[PDB]
Design a protein around this ligand. Structure first.
Ligand SMILES: Nc1ncnc2c1ncn2[C@@H]1O[C@H](COP(=O)(O)O)[C@@H](O)[C@H]1O
Ligand SMILES: Nc1ncnc2c1ncn2[C@@H]1O[C@H](COP(=O)(O)O)[C@@H](O)[C@H]1O
Ligand SMILES: [Ca+2]
Ligand SMILES: [Mg+2]
Ligand SMILES: [Mg+2]
Ligand SMILES: [Mn+2]
Ligand SMILES: [Mn+2]
Lengths: 366, 369
């Protein structure tokens, strides 16, 4: 039986929270409370609003019922686990939308046809552009769909755990990007399983194949084992003879991959209150894994032992080794949203710096 | 439910054909006839002989029963299709063994674990062999990879699976669809039963590294990655150190080139073997072409039985794929061969390839006049 979207497709009572999607520190946990914690509708409701904000329904003649059917089925297959749940998917989708639609100081834009723009884009100053002016709508839509799908049916275990235990999924994917291959494959399988889910019906065959390829490339880019390769490749392309060439499809793909990568690990670049809640989630998953490791007679992985937590060290090293260099690379390309204030004020990097200082201070006291 | 190796594990009346495993043009189709078509034993019988020739049973304290159990289950899961069958697996395994055991002119043995064929004399000074440069564990992974590398092939190409949204293409996100499946299904089979655990005396570290090598070798057989492997190899050959046999990544790359060459060895065999293999592959292509038509898709190049271009297919396959791969492998100085007495080397493999290329060219000339 198909999982179909519930009640009236669009919920009416969420208007005041949804108007604040144009903010970086979107109060996603307030939205969760407003909807109901295990209601299973947050992803489809946010997705509807963002697609409508971008005019993507008109751009691709997307039937809304099938769109909501699919995004509801998708959200239902995110498990009720502390971090890799439908709330995290929604968060990543919101982050890729922000990064691609919000004003970027001194970015040059194609328009200001095959491009779409957010209704929240109000600056008419030529000293501001946005990524959606440089990346065609089809490719942007793939990125958004990828974000919604990117952790589908996550089991609450890391790739290394699946591999070390010879989990059926690790055997199936030959130890290579096990979770990410699964997310993409299971979400695509879900999509093709029912005509009630076919919201892409008005793409031609060529468009559809290219869309599918972009979605897969974006989802597979979320494997952190490939992190340093993506960052080196991006830094290489930024510092060459011409820089990012927006007319080159491979350059655009690489930009989209950096975008979804940053969106996926956005937590440490949010306000303290959001960052801390998300952090609680991730470590609760780690601890569940640690318990399973112990019961299997394996050594408990670093930072996964609930009876010897090293929260501050985890967050500090994650920021210094992963998020920090990724933000620096993205910022050096001049792709970070921000405001002119001759100088630029960038909220995202400011938050990251503040959160890094906070964890450092905790480490000093310990 | 366990598929077990049948009757006496080693069939006893095949020593006349098996003695010829040391020949490149091994008469594999005569062995098929000798054993019985769809007896389902060719792969396990040859595997046993080559593992014994190398002393791998002693080297890894491999129990023979479990080894034969696994290789029999494996061979049973190769389908009765014209090309990607247990006979092709056996052929690829023979080819990797030949390439790794046979004298190679002017190859130096690594300074400073290793196994040697009973067919290799230590008195070779102006000759070496790959098995002297690649540790036994890694060699065994390559052999096992060759046996597994087309397991449960459906007789369709990756592009067909992808174009038709086959369940496997969706499962593997359109990336090396068949090759991922071969490796995953063969490993799953292996792990499914204790009766198959011939690797029981590897420690955990060894086992994990073995599994990694097997997967890397199998995944290297995807021709979509062909030019990448060849460029990478040519890059490594033409830099400051060349191949460094003490470097694990260089050795992996050598093994991948080996299995790649072994997999497409057909055009580099004698005309008799080449043409039989060719018949097999084009029969698979034509079955696919029929399915394409019935699905309303465009028939892929060279897959339309009612407008064959066999000669053009084989000529372009040799000139664009096999030829550059052989040239790369030869440039590394890894081709088996002999010194010409009375500076130069005679290489049987490249000679065959050149003869087969000329043959198909001649056929092309007749067709268009
Ligand atoms: N705040 C954080 N602290 C530590 N690891 C994190 C944090 N946020 C994300 N990660 C890791 O980053 C990766 C995100 O991948 P995923 O969420 O599965 O798409 C995983 O390896 C997470 O464990
Ligand atoms: N004689 C041949 N002519 C054309 N294509 C070939 C020939 N031999 C091998 N191939 C191709 O090589 C690919 C890789 O070999 P395999 O992994 O055994 O399928 C096959 O899928 C075929 O398309
Ligand atoms: Ca430069
Ligand atoms: Mg993930
Ligand atoms: Mg193959
Ligand atoms: Mn994620
Ligand atoms: Mn093959």
């Amino acid at each position: 039986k198909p999982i179909l979207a519930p009640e009236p497709l669009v919920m009416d009572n969420l208007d005041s929270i949804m108007e604040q999607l144009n903010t970086w520190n979107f109060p996603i946990f307030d939205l969760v409370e407003n909807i109901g914690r295990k209601c299973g509708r947050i992803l489809s409701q946010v997705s509807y609003r963002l697609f409508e904000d971008m005019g993507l329904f008109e751009a691709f003649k997307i039937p809304i019922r099938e769109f909501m059917n699919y995004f509801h089925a998708l959200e239902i297959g995110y498990r009720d686990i502390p971090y890799h749940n439908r709330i995290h998917a929604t968060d990543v989708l919101h982050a890729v939308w922000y990064l691609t639609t919000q004003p970027i100081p001194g970015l040059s834009t194609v328009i200001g046809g095959s491009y779409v723009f957010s209704k929240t884009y109000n600056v008419t100053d030529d000293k501001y552009g946005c990524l959606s002016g440089n990346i065609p709508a089809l490719e942007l839509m793939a990125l958004y769909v990828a974000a919604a799908m990117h952790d589908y049916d996550h089991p609450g275990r890391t790739n290394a755990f699946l591999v070390a235990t010879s989990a059926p999924q690790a055997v199936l994917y030959n130890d290579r990007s096990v979770l990410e291959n699964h997310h993409a494959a299971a979400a695509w399988n879900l999509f093709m399983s029912r005509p009630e889910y076919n919201f892409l019906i008005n793409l031609d065959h060529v468009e559809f194949k290219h869309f599918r390829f972009l979605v897969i490339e974006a989802i597979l880019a979320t494997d952190l084992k490939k992190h340093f390769d993506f960052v080196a490749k991006f830094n290489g392309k930024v510092n060459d003879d011409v820089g990012i060439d927006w007319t080159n499809e491979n350059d655009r793909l690489l930009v989209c991959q950096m975008c979804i990568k940053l969106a996926d690990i956005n937590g440490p670049a949010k306000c303290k209150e959001l960052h801390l809640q998300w952090t609680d989630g991730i470590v609760n998953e780690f601890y569940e894994q640690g318990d399973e490791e112990a019961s299997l007679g394996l050594p408990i992985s670093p930072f996964m032992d609930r009876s010897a937590p090293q929260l501050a060290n985890l967050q500090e090293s994650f920021i210094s080794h992963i998020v920090g260099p990724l933000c620096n690379s993205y910022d050096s390309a001049g792709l970070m949203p921000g405001k002119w204030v001759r100088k630029i004020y960038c909220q995202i990097t400011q938050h990251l710096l503040q959160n890094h200082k906070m964890w450092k201070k905790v480490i000093e006291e310990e």
